């Protein structure tokens, strides 16, 4: 073990969940999924029709991702440093947001779906980590032939958490399976293949592109139901809690641009695809909180800054950063 570098001692809460309505926040961490495929961003296809009959849901139209891997996107989005000044080797022994949140009060979850935090969650108690690739943990798992653990799966028993946790801030992270590659068509359940005919070969180059290309835009559909059920989960607790919801890909995808598939290239020479990300804000009515611009220039950097306001902490390190919400209040 190393000792911790600490960037946001000086964070504190302006307000606690005694004095006002406890807020509660899911952070869906997103896989695979490309901003230009998102019907909001001028997609051809419908994408995202759940996400499309929910009010209050803000479509961010230029996020590029910090990197193009899981191991090196997801600690910088939960970063201090940024990605200017981000180092993969060491964000594991710096202050991350969520160490800052847990330690002002603010109750922390983390479900994957995908893989794990990457190091985000290890200075916290292991109980905060739950394993939801694990079909004793996950209750949707049997649902298709591949015996793949489904997204949605995380939402089960969110409740329970909730109970446990009454009255208190909570933030709750659902790292998702999403759009991994190269079997798109693992990645969601027959409700959803809608797009059709579909590649269900493991060699990408060697199906026909139209095939590859319905198998991840039904990939997304699937996403796009787990977005929508998690706001609905999100809205059975608005009444005793402001409830909000960001969704965030890790990176892009290549599909055949220039030959290249999948993802990981080395920021030097990856293609923009794989940075070009979508990010997703709800919010209910009664929080208070009020989006950014669509067309806000943003980046992985935004993330952090974000969570701090949903809980109203302040931290010097972050003061001049944008964010995916404003600091004004319209009463
Ligand atoms: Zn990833």
Redesign the pocket.
């Known amino acids: 073990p190393k000792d911790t570098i600490y960037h946001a001692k000086d964070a504190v809460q302006a307000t606690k969940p005694d004095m006002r309505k406890p807020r509660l926040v899911v952070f869906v961490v997103g ?2 999924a490309r901003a230009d495929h998102v019907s909001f961003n001028g997609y051809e296809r419908d994408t995202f029709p759940q996400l499309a009959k929910i009010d209050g849901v803000t479509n961010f139209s230029n996020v590029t991702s910090c990197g193009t ?2 191991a090196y996107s997801v600690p910088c989005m939960f970063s201090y440093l940024g990605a200017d000044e981000y180092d993969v080797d060491t964000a594991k022994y710096q202050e991350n947001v969520l160490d800052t949140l847990d330690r002002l009060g603010v109750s922390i979850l983390w479900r994957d779906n995908n893989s794990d935090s990457k190091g985000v969650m290890d200075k916290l108690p292991k109980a905060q980590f739950a394993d939801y690739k694990s079909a004793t943990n996950n209750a949707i798992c049997n649902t298709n032939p591949y015996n793949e653990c489904r997204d949605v799966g995380m939402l089960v028993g969110l409740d329970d958490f909730v109970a446990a946790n009454n009255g208190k801030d909570m933030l709750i992270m659902l790292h998702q399976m999403g759009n991994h590659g190269p079997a798109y068509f693992k990645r969601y359940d027959e409700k959803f293949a809608k797009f059709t005919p579909v590649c269900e070969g493991n060699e990408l180059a060697k199906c026909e592109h139209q095939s590859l290309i319905n198998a991840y835009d039904n990939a997304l559909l699937a996403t796009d139901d787990f977005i929508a059920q998690s706001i609905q989960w999100l809205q059975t607790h608005s009444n005793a809690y402001d409830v909000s919801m960001l969704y965030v890909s ?2 892009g995808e290549s599909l055949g641009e220039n030959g290249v598939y999948l993802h990981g290239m080395p920021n030097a020479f990856a293609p923009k695809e794989q940075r070009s990300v979508p990010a997703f804000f709800w919010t209910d009515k009664q929080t208070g909180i009020t989006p950014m611009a669509t067309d806000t220039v943003l980046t992985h950097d935004a993330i952090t800054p974000t969570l701090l306001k949903l809980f109203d902490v302040t931290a010097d390190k972050v003061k001049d950063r944008t964010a995916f919400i404003r600091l004004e209040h319209h009463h």
Do not use: L, P
């Open positions: 896989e695979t891997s899981t890790d990176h």
